[PDB]
Amino acid sequence: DMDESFIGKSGGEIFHEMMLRQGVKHIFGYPGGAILPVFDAIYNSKHFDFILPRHEQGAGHMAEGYARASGKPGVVVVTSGPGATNVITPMQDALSDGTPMVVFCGQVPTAAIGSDAFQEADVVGISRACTKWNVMVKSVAELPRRINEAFEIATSGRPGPVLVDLPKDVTAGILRRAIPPSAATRAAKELSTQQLNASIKRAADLINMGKKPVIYAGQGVIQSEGGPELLKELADKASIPVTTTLHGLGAFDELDEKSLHMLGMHGAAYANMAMQQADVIIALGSRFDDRVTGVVSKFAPAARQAAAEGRGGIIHFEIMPKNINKVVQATEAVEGDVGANMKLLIPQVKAKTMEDRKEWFDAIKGWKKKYPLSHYQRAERTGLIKPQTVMEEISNLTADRKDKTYIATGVGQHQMWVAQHFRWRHPRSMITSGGLGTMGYGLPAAIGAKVAQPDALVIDVDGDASFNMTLTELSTAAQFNIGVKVVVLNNEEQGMVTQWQNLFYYHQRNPDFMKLADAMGIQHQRVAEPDKLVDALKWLINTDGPALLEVVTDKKVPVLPMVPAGSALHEFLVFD
Amino acid sequence: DESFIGKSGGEIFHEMMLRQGVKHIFGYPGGAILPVFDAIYNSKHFDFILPRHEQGAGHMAEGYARASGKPGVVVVTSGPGATNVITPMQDALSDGTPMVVFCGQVPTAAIGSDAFQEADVVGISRACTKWNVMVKSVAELPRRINEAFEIATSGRPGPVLVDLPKDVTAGILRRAIAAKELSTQQLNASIKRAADLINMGKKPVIYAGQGVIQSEGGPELLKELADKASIPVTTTLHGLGAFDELDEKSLHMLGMHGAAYANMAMQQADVIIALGSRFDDRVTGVVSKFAPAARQAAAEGRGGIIHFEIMPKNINKVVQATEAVEGDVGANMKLLIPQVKAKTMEDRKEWFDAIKGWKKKYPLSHYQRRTGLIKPQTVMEEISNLTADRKDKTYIATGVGQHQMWVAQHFRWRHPRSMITSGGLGTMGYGLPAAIGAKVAQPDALVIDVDGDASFNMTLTELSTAAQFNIGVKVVVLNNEEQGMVTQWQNLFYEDRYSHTHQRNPDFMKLADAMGIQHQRVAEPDKLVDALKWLINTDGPALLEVVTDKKVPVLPMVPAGSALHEFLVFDPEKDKQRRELMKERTKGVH
């Protein structure tokens, strides 16, 4: 069957109509020459709100935070050439962290491609390696199909960024024509179904054998329909302790007695202890990246010994086949959506009580007593604010509304401190750049997050160097009155790299953040005395509209515990 | 050979910088590049500039390379460090700026595993570099640094990217490291043929671009040719400064926002001598209607298009050259001039009388000027006036948009490399970072960033870099509260439907105050001259905000679909009824 409703509409007008059909309600973008047919067509549209950032890197990272906070794909519209290349970093960022994004960019007319035309770049060639799929739309008649293909690809499997190049003749032009089982299919499907059920049955047998089980949950659980609920059901039924990755934070309730909190190079000592001695590791929507495993050959020794002896090992619930057996050899690989497959797993996992796991949870509670996160060096009343305490007091101050609190971060020491010291209870509350780790992410991601969740508290916990990268987007929050709260940790150092240069081998001076925030039209306060911190934070989270709070912290504060390079996950250095 | 044994890849890098004459490095640390960073940071052999954003690092390296003819050197970490340099890289590829981007990478054993901060950077940056390579072993490090500097500076210069895996730069080095030129006969034959074309030309025009400024001895030779044969000279945007715009033969800039008289001359010339330029679509208008008089001449055998070009892929890409002269334009101009016959201005009275008549008919000074709000063209005219005694030590970097065309049109360019601007990619945000790198390259010169507000908003965080390092650039921010160039396009083509082309703007006085940078704001026509006098006479970084008139069109304009001679010109009556129809639609808002 064929669609006639586009006949006589420009490509720009068709685009505006496809945003309607795709449920898009917010677009982030910046105009220019090649994309003008599309901007003219979304001119004053009542069908979605349009955020104009300062820089189209702002637009991309806002689209990521929007996606992180809502589960919907962030949509970006930029011009050809430098408008497209300015989104390359957010694209690689989204690909690394599985964030769904559709990036639409102008392109010179199809006839001009290859001529080195004004504002021409081989954007499909540049962006291939940093998108999950991309395409140049070559005729207004294929435009609605390509837009669909793009939205579906971004949002399925492991989500990811997709780039659609829109030549100016495609969007300024006028469409003039209408546009659009098996026996072997049933046998292929049953062959896949048998393979999946057998995998889940063996996964359950392994879990049922295990005397020291652990769930290693990641972002995939949060990105799965019903994932957190199913995870809770599984952890409760079999009384299994649960650790998350940085991106899995909030997938499990960190006030539950079974919570091990975050594992990894900067994770809880007890989470790492648990993973190093578990005999069954159940990896749910996580990818064994190197910040988590440490030296891979030393990762999970007891799980490997168990697999070796037929009495356990490593179970891996993964939707993307390329990520199965990439880094760690799974004893049992359960392919596909972790929500759907946990639904089939749980009724075959036998129930176990806490009392059944007394020895395991006694070891875990021992490690928690010995290595509590809350033990670090606190400020003397005449010193500067400790950064860990900033995170603790933000968590205390939001404890009664964690279901509507979104934390976005920069990259560095502060990103690890909030992971460690804020208590995570809400899925999608952690909005942070993990795989690529892009300083500058925090403020624009927080802005997009607040756009997606206008009724939530959204805080950008941002180190000063990171915040210096994209601080121009404060104008975006001010122009549009997007009520993000910004906490700038001013220590005048690139804390994470000076931590590395102090362990393995040295520091910039900041603008005046009160004057700057004044220049940008943002409510602002400064705070350096420990006794004043809590009240400063109460002011920030109760302001109306966008606000910023500078927290003068001291320098050379360690991130502990840390698993240094060359060490195993159990070879962490904690505070003494 | 054998001299580098025992040293780490970082130390080896450190020395290849010495052997390449690198005195200035722009960069930003990370884990994967720390071996290189430990090496060269703290060294007394280099000035290391640490910006806020690696994009700043790249544009800085571009402006440094524009003002100095030396390659800009960038050192960043893997992943987000390298991807943040992709726009500077594309921008440099499009404008032929020599640049060597060194970026950290994960250890070679970790590549392809989605390791921490890993990207396929050679894959991402292949399409936007001249060439790129991943260094696979300490031993190939010297050879690859050499090749990279060689490619970035040869032919048409451009950016190269070198991927440095962390184990290559931490590892220790333990090893050691017939023809017949009938081509000369043919080059010489075609230089002679080109001279015969110039000598027979009755209406010659030199169309000069950036390749002249990029060729050693290029401007000197361009002036000798133009003087000897009395040939009028027009330049592209990047060519501004290759020829003295105060010379009576100067036609100024051609193209979509070129002088009407330069465009006229190109369309009526019978011999177009194209020196180190590439027939950009911002230059030619509709190509089929470009250079009718020279195509007509070429057919009849009495003229045509001479193209002096170093990159073969760029000859005959857009326009058929009647006579192509491949190679360096300066070296080839040394061989051309002795074969060209001297002619005085008077020998060419008829041609220069046509040009003079075009100049009276369409002077660049005829724009709406009574003294309520400041007009952006006057700002550019006064900068030209106030630096007239020092144009040879004056460097202008710009953003992208109306202000960039206005300074192209209304500043009188006289110094090679004085025009520092993004023309090929056209990257808003280029100005301030490029001005910072230029002033690093020319510490004793006066360096000005003529920036529109939207452009400036893109990268204004680099004001901290000028403050921290005390890099004395002078910033002129034209405050019109709009994406001026795009509102023109929407006014022209879209019935004043101003779709998302207006932005708030921070308080620039407070912003400059916040960054520790001396600052003034001017809004009155009477005070403009004193404002700019204060700015150019400060010490260290400074910023001036000029509040200007809104909705000011850039004229003349050759709009889309027009031949180079079919331009629009300023009409006082159309302008006051353009503002009036704009007010009914926008319902009193504009």
Ligand SMILES: Cc1cc2nc3c(=O)[nH]c(=O)nc-3n(C[C@H](O)[C@H](O)[C@H](O)COP(=O)(O)OP(=O)(O)OC[C@H]3O[C@@H](n4cnc5c(N)ncnc54)[C@H](O)[C@@H]3O)c2cc1C
């Ligand atoms: C300075 C710094 C320090 C860091 N330190 C740590 C640290 O100590 N600990 C830590 O954990 N991280 C740390 N990180 C973050 C780290 O680099 C990774 O980004 C993070 O570990 C990835 O977590 P993840 O595997 O849950 O998420 P992702 O990287 O998004 O992987 C999720 C996996 O789930 C799969 N998936 C998605 N949807 C589904 C579905 N429906 N069903 C099944 N599978 C699905 C995906 O395909 C993928 O394989 C740090 C980052 C930085 C910048």
Ligand SMILES: Cc1cc2nc3c(=O)[nH]c(=O)nc-3n(C[C@H](O)[C@H](O)[C@H](O)COP(=O)(O)OP(=O)(O)OC[C@H]3O[C@@H](n4cnc5c(N)ncnc54)[C@H](O)[C@@H]3O)c2cc1C
């Ligand atoms: C908003 C906007 C408006 C613009 N409007 C105009 C306009 O009106 N007019 C205009 O002219 N431009 C304009 N531009 C700039 C334009 O798009 C191009 O960037 C510019 O015209 C290119 O100038 P060029 O050919 O001199 O330099 P390049 O693009 O750098 O080309 C130089 C050429 O010289 C060759 N070359 C290099 N070195 C040598 C050598 N040693 N010997 C021989 N050949 C050599 C190169 O290979 C290349 O072919 C505009 C840009 C923007 C953003």
Ligand SMILES: Cc1ncc(Cn2c(C)c(CCOP(=O)(O)OP(=O)(O)O)sc2=O)c(N)n1
């Ligand atoms: C865009 C970019 N460039 C460089 C890096 C390398 N890098 C750098 C320079 C870090 C220091 C972050 O400093 P900060 O002020 O933002 O936060 P802390 O002081 O709390 O560490 S952390 C890190 O991974 C990066 N992650 N991202």
Ligand SMILES: Cc1ncc(Cn2c(C)c(CCOP(=O)(O)OP(=O)(O)O)sc2=O)c(N)n1
């Ligand atoms: C990075 C980027 N984004 C978008 C564009 C598209 N674009 C835009 C948005 C222009 C308006 C520039 O406004 P300005 O304030 O910087 O200067 P004017 O008001 O004088 O035009 S000009 C132009 O080419 C671009 N060139 N570069």
Ligand SMILES: CCC/C=C/C=C/C(=O)[C@@H]1C(=O)[C@H](C[C@@](O)(C(=O)O)C(C)C)N(C)C1=O
């Ligand atoms: C390539 C980047 C540089 C861009 C410069 C700006 C160009 C333009 O702005 C116009 C424009 O945008 C109209 C389109 C159209 O919609 C119109 O109504 O006028 C029409 C085809 C229906 N064209 C064809 C242009 O070149």
Ligand SMILES: [Mg+2]
């Ligand atoms: Mg810091």
Ligand SMILES: [Mg+2]
């Ligand atoms: Mg402007």
